[PDB]
Design a protein around this nucleic acid. Sequence first.
DNA 1: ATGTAAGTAGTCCGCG
DNA 2: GCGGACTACTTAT
Length: 903
Amino acid sequence: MKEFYLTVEQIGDSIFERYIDSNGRERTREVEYKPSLFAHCPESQATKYFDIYGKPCTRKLFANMRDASQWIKRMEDIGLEALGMDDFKLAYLSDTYNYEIKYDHTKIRVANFDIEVTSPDGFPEPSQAKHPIDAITHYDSIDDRFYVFDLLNSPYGNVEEWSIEIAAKLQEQGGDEVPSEIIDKIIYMPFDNEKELLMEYLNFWQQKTPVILTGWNVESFAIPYVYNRIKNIFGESTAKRLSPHRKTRVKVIENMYGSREIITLFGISVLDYIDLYKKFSFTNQPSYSLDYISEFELNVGKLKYDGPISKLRESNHQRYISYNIIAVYRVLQIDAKRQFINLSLDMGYYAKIQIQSVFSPIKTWDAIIFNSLKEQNKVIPQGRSHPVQPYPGAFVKEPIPNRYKYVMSFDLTSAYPSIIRQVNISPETIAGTFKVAPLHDYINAVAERPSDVYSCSPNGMMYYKDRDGVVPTEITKVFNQRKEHKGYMLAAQRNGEIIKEALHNPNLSVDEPLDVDYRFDFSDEIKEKIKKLSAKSLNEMLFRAQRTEVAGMTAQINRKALINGLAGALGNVWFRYYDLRNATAITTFGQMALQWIERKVNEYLNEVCGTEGEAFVLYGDTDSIYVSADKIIDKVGESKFRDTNHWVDFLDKFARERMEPAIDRGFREMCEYMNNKQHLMFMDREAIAGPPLGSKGIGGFWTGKKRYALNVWDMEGTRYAEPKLKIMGLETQKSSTPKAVQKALKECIRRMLQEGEESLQEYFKEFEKEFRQLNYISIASVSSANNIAKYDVGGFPGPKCPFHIRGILTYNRAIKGNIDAPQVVEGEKVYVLPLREGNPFGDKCIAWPSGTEITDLIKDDVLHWMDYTVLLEKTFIKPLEGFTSAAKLDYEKKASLFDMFDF
DNA sequence: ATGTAAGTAGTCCGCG
DNA sequence: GCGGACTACTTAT
Ligand SMILES: [Ca+2]
Ligand SMILES: [Ca+2]
Ligand SMILES: [Ca+2]
Ligand SMILES: [Ca+2]
Ligand SMILES: [Ca+2]
Ligand SMILES: [Ca+2]
Ligand SMILES: [Ca+2]
């Protein structure tokens, strides 16, 4: 096979590389890498190296990497540019792998692990590691085995061996329900003392040295704890055995009360799954406990046990170990669904970076662009210092707050990357400037044509048309991958709806799910067979289609994020190609595009409807327009439609056959006006929205910018079996809103949009009557908690103390003394509840760590003193007041003259 | 070391 | 009690 790297490090004048060789075996090597950098030279000097602007450079080949670094310093002292890749391991990877890396993940050792540490005096801090590690479960992807290291003897108790037979049993029969599919994959190793457990773990680690190291919170807990515990017991040089090159760096952050640290293990790529999840999942969760995320992602139940975790090992060691094993497996299950490890490997090898650098779009793009430029013997510019400078972004239209019955939305495909490609925006394609007119003059096509020679943006910049920029070139490659995966996601989505439709009439038979590729629209013959399948087979097919959709989602949305990240990186001062002329060239062109096409759409619809001056576009944000379709429907008359799906078909066709071609003509004119390199403004229909035919539903409403709700029947060509709410910005979409309130507000919206005012009033009345009976956690608000110490004056609130921070201080006073009460961690999330006046906590609210039950000693008082009235008022009624006043209807029946009668 | 726009709701304080 | 300046948090793109 082709060789490919696993890990790379720079350690002094040596590059240390782990790799897979041509026989597919893992190897390691130390290389005295001889790097090159470059300096500008006179034109007379013949060379093969040119900077991106075409000025000649001379190559400086160095004896070692230190000499190269020292030269960069002297060039700074002299005042001349030092060109080339200054991150020498990227240069090394580029020289060593001068071809498209084709990697085989079955050769890459991916390790998932988790440890347990019993601690009777609070959270076991990794930096001190003063308590025994009494369990480790370590899954190895090459072996496909869970290696379990179990401490039987400890100062906090001596226990019997864990029983795999009890672990496999149902909970309801006193077992632990360790899933059957991993029982045969467990390798259990008990130990009589911690030293031999740890010694054996290190030897194991030597034999099976992780390349990718992951798990839940491993970076902030498991890794530093293991490292520091081994250091304390055996010494630092033993702890360094966790690095295959025996090198580590200890990063210590101090939070004033008290301290913690991150350990860099040289030669390992740590991808903490919590970090992968936060970057790649596009959720914002109220809690990031593994229980909460597992339930959210997998629909599995919370691993329950009686009593505190500090006493679980002693009271039920059997369950303690099973839960350690299950927790490692849960992460693997989440990754089987989300496929973030696969994404990370794809991206890292594509860019030729350390795999952990996928967290940095700047590093990723620096590497992609460097490699692209190197291939043409071009030399990259030196990174420079720039001061932070705010700059303008997107245009958002102010909507008239209102109900909006029939709506059709359209937006640009990959807007900012498409702008880059159309205009040809790159550091080396800049041709000059032109004198700018006010933006509205371009929007209304009264401004002078910027140029008949160069491709332009209304920020005043001009770019060469007949030569390709590295930014457009490389952004196009990732966009095309993005487009492929999005196609697969949408096919799977459409296939899902076909299955949902068929589930209305399942067949009474025993059959199997069809063997199909869900990434492609089902053939007619598959559709016929589906109509004869049982519920059993259909539900399994639906699950597979949904997993295929999620896999496509992960692949497309994160490639979308990467290319959008390039447009944004042009505005980050740490990006090598930082340039506000290019950053603003993008954002200003986007502003023009949206408002240009708003004008063109209004012009077109007035024309076809035979009217003049009517406002059809009701809203837009960045690259989208929302068109009121009421007049389109009224033109033919509602009476002509047989059912909801008939008018949906009508507008779908209208959008595709009439509006899109008008939109396209509008943008081709704009492209010619700016003399752009290539027309790439493709504004396709997103949503078709309205109430069910014959209902009193209002269809949709806006309260303001970035705040609206729509009843959607078709989304980007997916015709839904059941209408789906598209709600943006409203409290149902905010992780700070209590769970049960999100749910109740969503149902208020559903009723408003689908059923009408009276349905809403009916629901509101019921929820108000029953909400006092809801679980306290389900009605608690949520907030991130930053700068707790700043507002902490003797355990009491300092001036301008935020409400949630006040609650944390109340909690801290209440638990003072308790060494078992969970502490609120700085920057993490807390549940928050208001408290009635005269409560024993001595303040108007309390807050505790999110995703947890509040500690049992104060739980009773919280429940007794919860202010339900304030809670309902603030979290539910107030948002609902905003929705309903915007939509011009009432959530409570108004008093009237009719109240005088007995109905 | 991806970007900016923009929403709600908190504290503080003014207001015969 | 409500609105304006300021702070915190969160979301839409
Ligand atoms: Ca645990
Ligand atoms: Ca069960
Ligand atoms: Ca878009
Ligand atoms: Ca059937
Ligand atoms: Ca959009
Ligand atoms: Ca689209
Ligand atoms: Ca109590």
